[PDB]
Each structure stands twice: as structure tokens, then as C-alpha cells.
Design an enzyme around this catalytic site. Structure first.
Site, PDB file in Angstrom:
ATOM      1  N   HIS B  41       0.805  -1.219   0.000  1.00 53.74           N
ATOM      2  CA  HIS B  41       0.000   0.000   0.000  1.00 53.74           C
ATOM      3  C   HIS B  41       0.843   1.278   0.000  1.00 53.74           C
ATOM      4  O   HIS B  41       0.268   2.357   0.005  1.00 53.74           O
ATOM      5  CB  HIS B  41      -1.078   0.026   1.104  1.00 53.74           C
ATOM      6  CG  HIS B  41      -0.592   0.251   2.504  1.00 53.74           C
ATOM      7  ND1 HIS B  41      -0.342   1.526   2.988  1.00 53.74           N
ATOM      8  CD2 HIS B  41      -0.465  -0.631   3.525  1.00 53.74           C
ATOM      9  CE1 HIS B  41      -0.011   1.372   4.263  1.00 53.74           C
ATOM     10  NE2 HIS B  41      -0.074   0.092   4.632  1.00 53.74           N
ATOM     11  N   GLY B 137       2.490   5.944  10.345  1.00 49.37           N
ATOM     12  CA  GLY B 137       3.906   5.853  10.011  1.00 49.37           C
ATOM     13  C   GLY B 137       4.558   4.562  10.473  1.00 49.37           C
ATOM     14  O   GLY B 137       5.715   4.292  10.135  1.00 49.37           O
ATOM     15  N   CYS B 139       3.537   1.480   9.665  1.00 54.49           N
ATOM     16  CA  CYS B 139       3.367   0.451   8.621  1.00 54.49           C
ATOM     17  C   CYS B 139       4.715  -0.048   8.134  1.00 54.49           C
ATOM     18  O   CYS B 139       5.619   0.759   7.920  1.00 54.49           O
ATOM     19  CB  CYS B 139       2.500   0.961   7.470  1.00 54.49           C
ATOM     20  SG  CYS B 139       0.778   1.334   7.931  1.00 54.49           S
TER      21      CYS B 139
HETATM   22  C1  LIG Z   1      -4.249   7.880  13.676  1.00 57.36           C
HETATM   23  C2  LIG Z   1      -4.115   6.507  14.330  1.00 57.36           C
HETATM   24  C3  LIG Z   1      -5.442   6.096  14.961  1.00 57.36           C
HETATM   25  O1  LIG Z   1      -3.159   6.643  15.403  1.00 57.36           O
HETATM   26  C4  LIG Z   1      -3.623   5.451  13.338  1.00 57.36           C
HETATM   27  C5  LIG Z   1      -3.873   5.564  11.970  1.00 57.36           C
HETATM   28  C6  LIG Z   1      -3.391   4.658  11.072  1.00 57.36           C
HETATM   29  C7  LIG Z   1      -2.619   3.547  11.500  1.00 57.36           C
HETATM   30  C8  LIG Z   1      -2.122   2.533  10.617  1.00 57.36           C
HETATM   31  N1  LIG Z   1      -2.378   2.649   9.232  1.00 57.36           N
HETATM   32  C9  LIG Z   1      -3.514   2.350   8.561  1.00 57.36           C
HETATM   33  O2  LIG Z   1      -4.445   1.712   9.044  1.00 57.36           O
HETATM   34  C10 LIG Z   1      -3.597   2.945   7.169  1.00 57.36           C
HETATM   35  C11 LIG Z   1      -4.389   2.081   6.212  1.00 57.36           C
HETATM   36  C12 LIG Z   1      -5.644   2.477   5.766  1.00 57.36           C
HETATM   37  C13 LIG Z   1      -6.393   1.658   4.936  1.00 57.36           C
HETATM   38  C14 LIG Z   1      -5.901   0.423   4.542  1.00 57.36           C
HETATM   39  C15 LIG Z   1      -4.655   0.037   4.984  1.00 57.36           C
HETATM   40 CL1  LIG Z   1      -4.044  -1.535   4.541  1.00 57.36          CL
HETATM   41  C16 LIG Z   1      -3.889   0.850   5.799  1.00 57.36           C
HETATM   42  C17 LIG Z   1      -1.427   1.478  11.204  1.00 57.36           C
HETATM   43  N2  LIG Z   1      -1.175   1.343  12.512  1.00 57.36           N
HETATM   44  C18 LIG Z   1      -1.616   2.286  13.320  1.00 57.36           C
HETATM   45  C19 LIG Z   1      -2.359   3.413  12.896  1.00 57.36           C
HETATM   46  C20 LIG Z   1      -2.879   4.377  13.788  1.00 57.36           C
END
Ligand SMILES: CC(C)(O)c1ccc2c(NC(=O)Cc3cccc(Cl)c3)cncc2c1
Ligand SMILES: CC(C)(O)c1ccc2c(NC(=O)Cc3cccc(Cl)c3)cncc2c1
Ligand SMILES: [Cl-]
EC number: 3.4.19.12
Lengths: 305, 299
Positions: B41, B137, B139
Site C-alpha cells: 500500500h 507511520g 506500517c
Molecule cells: C491515527 C491513528 C489512529 O493513530 C492510526 C492511523 C493509522 C494507522 C495505521 N495505518 C492504517 O491503518 C492505514 C491504512 C488504511 C487503509 C488500509 C490500509 Cl491496509 C492501511 C497502522 N497502525 C496504526 C495506525 C494508527
């Protein structure tokens, strides 16, 4: 989102662990530049521990009596001196993996990561706090002596603890990296007991602020308290007195959530009175006191849910 | 003495973290030999092959510390993007990509912009989510175990679900659980307690001098499994009983003897008491984690 007891990445400390052997004793040492730091009780037998005269035991030792092992390589000892309860072994090779570092002495309530080692090899890493009674609730077995506690702020490793011993209640005692013990302990087999432990109030408050940041407000109430009335109540539950310094330190968390420190103090008062009633805070059924206000700002988001 | 949630030393994994940027997205990558692995992604209803066919090597910016790595190729394997780089990682450890099972635990090295910020232990939940601590961040942050000197990579972080829990893949890009890599209505299924882990943790309490919960009673595996089903506990299988054998032998407490103690905690609570400093029954320590911490195994 989420909140875990998180340790610092141990890599910069793993590159400093060596094995120190003196006669039959084998424990861990910290190799920084051309010096290996380890507990001075490496020179002791189990017999000497009752009343050891370290100066007399050390004067009888020569450099070749100490065996230092860094990985598979043998390090040559070229000098030795004692500084308080730590033995400093001068070696012939500087550690190429020496990180940027500082020796810091911490205060009770401060947290740090522990890299537990046996025979100069790291086995695990965990987070913990210096308790108000100057002991640490660690996870250590025989051979762990010389394991170090540290914080990594930016790219610099702050060494704050060297493990020395286990007390009869299963808790641990050690020194800063200058060999000065935390608490009224001695590196002697004596009837020394950990003083009554207390809860680190400023940390429980910090953790309640982290719960508010993560969307949990069930524990808040419409009450406030004076700093004095809060301390009069908290002492009854074995909580550390909350000082004006603690209130000032909680300022940024209070500003970020819009909840005054004494309003948070009021909900802590209520929590102590009522318990949790089947509910949890950040996945815990107990009030957590091993996260400082600094740890909460570091781990939690800057934007409240 | 002492019992803590303990992670593996992260050093061999820290030497593999890189920063990957594609357009405006910035996440973490795992640099092993001449390949950087990261969530697909980073290029983002997305048709990943169609988005990727439009990309060139220079569209990906890989940063290892202060050095820039030059991308020379790219391919996709399930939900992970594999970036072929011009430099082998000299800090590459001995490694394997393993897929773990729910109940198994692992260490997480959380990173932001290719830099590790923290390490923590956690378990793959029965619902295939992890209760991690991650921010935007994170990921590309990885999950791992260490077996002797070999790093077993088992998880790459991909996303956060609406309940604050996390989802990701093994290092081959196959998700754990019925999740997909895209913005849609995804919910974590009802979670269950990992019974074999609670039992292992009760054995660790006995080893550490906590026996208040033990009784004179025993139970059949069948009669216990009814009680486990009533309290949202995972069924205890014969394999679980066999795996707990060494802990049962070390403490002198039969697995079904320990099962009767858990039955009384489930039906009556802790009554103001704690086990290993906890007021809840802890399920994120496997029987092997208990043995390793109560022995002194090093890497
Ligand atoms: C802002 C907040 C809640 O702290 C947060 C926001 C995003 C976070 C995150 N990334 C996602 O989920 C982005 C995403 C969106 C749609 C599909 C896919 Cl596969 C990935 C991973 N871990 C903690 C995350 C924590
Ligand atoms: C086996 C057991 C009780 O779990 C254990 C045994 C020993 C442990 C240990 N070593 C010592 O205490 C050595 C020692 C002895 C007397 C005085 C001094 Cl200053 C040092 C350090 N940490 C955990 C330890 C745990
Ligand atoms: Cl401090």
C-alpha cells in the site's frame, strides 16, 4: 492507538555485553571504549559475601586473573581499579561497537529498559521503573549480575543501572554506572530488606491522561481537590506524595486533554475509593504506575480521540 | 525471580530497518540482502497491479540511515512489495520467514521513518489481530522471534482496525485473518482467551511462589472444555495438554489439576488477590516463553 509497556531498542547495548570470569564466578560486563564495567562482587566467593573486604580481595588479584570474553574473542586485561561497588577492567581493545553514551543516576519513579544477559549474551529486554523503595521489580536469574538498565534519548544511550543482587522478597537491587547503589543496600549477604513500597502517583496520573487520549473517560468525575486533601487520601492507599513539581510535570498532558491536574487527582481519589467495578483502563484491571509523564508523551498521539 | 512481558533483543532487526517513500506516502521497509520488503500500500478500491505497472524504480526512495539506496527492480508478492536494491545489507542476519498460528507470541520493533522507536512483546490473537501500540507511520514495522542465532520474521504491520487493534501479514504478504489492504468496513471478530497461555502463566506463578489458587481437585478435559466455552476461552486440546507436560512435571501439578484451579478462578474470581502482580488472567505468554524466562536462554 493502543498502549503497551514499551522498551527501547536494545541493539546499541547488545554490542557492549561481555562475559567476565574471576576464578569460579561468571557474570556480565559492559564494554565501553577500552573499559569493561562489572559488579565488584565478581572477585568474591559465596564465603566472602558475609563480610567482604573488597580492597583486601582486589589487592591479591592480577590482570590475568580476570577473563573477559566478547563474543568468541578473548579480551586482554591490562589494568584494574574499583570505583565504589563497580570494578573497572582496562582492556587492550576499544569496543568498535561503542555507542554515543552517558552514565546517569536516576530518581525513584523514573523508568528504563533492561537488557537481561547470562554469560555475556543478551536473553531478553523489558521495561521497568525504579521503585520508591529503590528496588526494581525485574526478571532475573543467577548469572544476570552485570545486566544493565538504560534509556535511549535521540541517538545517545543513558546507562542508569547495573544489576547486582536479588533481595529475599524476589525484588532486585543494583547501582548506577559509578558503583553507587540505589537505596540503603550493600553488596554483602546481610539481613537487609526492601522498605515498604509505595505507588508512584505521578505515573498513575500520567497513565490516566494516556487513557483519556485513547478515548476513555469513564473514570472522570465533576469534582476537584486541593493538593493537600489529595495527599491526605492517597497516603492512606500507600501512594507517594504528589508534589508541586509533579503537578508542573503533568502540565503538558493537562493542556493536551483539557483536564486540570487536580481534576485528574479527584478522579484518582474516586478510583481508589470505588475500585474499577468490572471495568479496565488501557486493558488493565489495576492502576499502572510504571509509565512516566515523559513516556506517555513519547508513546501516545499528539491528537486526542 | 520476577516475571515480565519480555521481548527478544531487537539488535539483529534494527540493522534491517529502512525508510520507503513512494510519492507522498512514507512507511518502513525490511532490508535483507539486496531486497527491501514493505507493505504494497506504499504505492496507494485499489488495483495494485495497475498502480504498480505505472511505477518506475526511481519513483521509490529508500533510505538506510543517512545513505540513499538505489532501486534497480520491483515485484509484488501477495500484499508485500519487494524492492530490488543495488546494495546488499551488510548487517543482514541469519533469517527465515515463518507464518505463526493464533496464540503464538513475538516481538515487535515499532518504527517511524525507518527508525526504531521501541520494542514490545505481543501475541497473535485467536481473531488474527494484534493488540499492538502503533501510530501513523508504523506500517512496515516487523514481528519476530529468535531461535538460537536465527531471526524468524513473522509479521509486517499493515493497518489499524476501528477498535484500535492491528492487522498485518506474514513476510510473504499473506494477511493473518479475513482482512484486506484497503479502506473498507473491516471488523475484528469476537476475541477469545488463549487457554493454553493462561495455564502456562499459572504454572509460572507456581514457580515464583504463588500457590493460593491451587486446590485438591481435578477435572476431565471434556468437563473443563464446557467451562472454557462459557467464558469465551479457546478450547483446550490434547496437544495443549502435551505441550504443558514439562511445566506440569517441573511443578508437580497435573495439567487437569491446573485446569480445575482455572475453573475456580473463572467461576469465582480473584477476591482481591493478584497472580504475578495481575488482577486479570494473562494469556500472552506461551508455554515456551514460560520455560525460556524461567531458565535463562541467550542469543
Ligand atoms: C491515527 C491513528 C489512529 O493513530 C492510526 C492511523 C493509522 C494507522 C495505521 N495505518 C492504517 O491503518 C492505514 C491504512 C488504511 C487503509 C488500509 C490500509 Cl491496509 C492501511 C497502522 N497502525 C496504526 C495506525 C494508527
Ligand atoms: C535462583 C534465584 C533465587 O532466582 C536467583 C538467584 C540469584 C540471583 C542474583 N544473584 C545474586 O543475588 C548474587 C549475590 C549474592 C549475594 C550478594 C550479592 Cl550483592 C550478590 C541476581 N538476580 C537474580 C537472582 C535470582
Ligand atoms: Cl530521573
Amino acid at each position: 492507538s493502543g498502549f503497551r509497556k514499551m522498551a527501547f531498542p536494545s541493539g546499541k547495548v547488545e554490542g557492549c555485553m561481555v562475559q567476565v570470569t574471576c576464578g569460579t564466578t561468571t557474570l556480565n560486563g559492559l564494554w565501553l571504549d577500552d573499559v569493561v564495567y562489572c559488579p565488584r562482587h565478581v572477585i568474591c566467593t559465596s564465603e566472602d559475601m558475609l563480610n567482604p573486604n573488597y580492597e583486601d580481595l582486589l589487592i591479591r588479584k592480577s590482570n590475568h586473573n580476570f577473563l573477559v570474553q566478547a563474543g568468541n574473542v578473548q579480551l586482554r586485561v591490562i589494568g584494574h581499579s574499583m570505583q565504589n561497588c563497580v570494578l573497572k577492567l582496562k582492556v587492550d581493545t576499544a569496543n568498535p561497537k561503542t555507542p554515543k553514551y552517558k552514565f546517569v543516576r536516576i530518581q525513584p519513579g523514573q523508568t528504563f529498559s533492561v537488557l537481561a544477559c547470562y554469560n555475556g549474551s543478551p536473553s531478553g529486554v523489558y521495561q521497568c521503573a525504579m521503585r520508591p523503595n529503590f528496588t526494581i521489580k525485574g526478571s532475573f536469574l543467577n548469572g544476570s549480575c552485570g545486566s544493565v538498565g538504560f534509556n535511549i534519548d535521540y541517538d545517545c544511550v543513558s546507562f542508569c543501572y547495573m544489576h547486582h543482587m536479588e533481595l529475599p522478597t524476589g525484588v532486585h537491587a543494583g547501582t548506577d554506572l559509578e558503583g553507587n547503589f540505589y537505596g540503603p543496600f550493600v553488596d554483602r549477604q546481610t539481613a537487609q530488606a526492601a522498605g515498604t513500597d509505595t505507588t508512584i502517583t505521578v505515573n498513575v496520573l500520567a497513565w490516566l491522561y494516556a487513557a483519556v487520549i485513547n478515548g476513555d473517560r469513564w473514570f472522570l468525575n465533576r469534582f476537584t481537590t486541593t493538593l493537600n486533601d489529595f495527599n491526605l487520601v492517597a497516603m492512606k492507599y500507600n501512594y507517594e506524595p504528589l508534589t508541586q513539581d509533579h503537578v508542573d510535570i503533568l502540565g503538558p498532558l493537562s493542556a493536551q486533554t483539557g483536564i486540570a491536574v487536580l481534576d485528574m487527582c479527584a478522579s484518582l481519589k474516586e478510583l481508589l475509593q470505588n475500585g474499577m467495578n468490572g471495568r479496565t483502563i488501557l486493558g488493565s484491571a489495576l492502576l499502572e504506575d510504571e509509565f512516566t509523564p515523559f513516556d506517555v508523551v513519547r508513546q501516545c498521539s499528539g491528537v486526542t480521540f
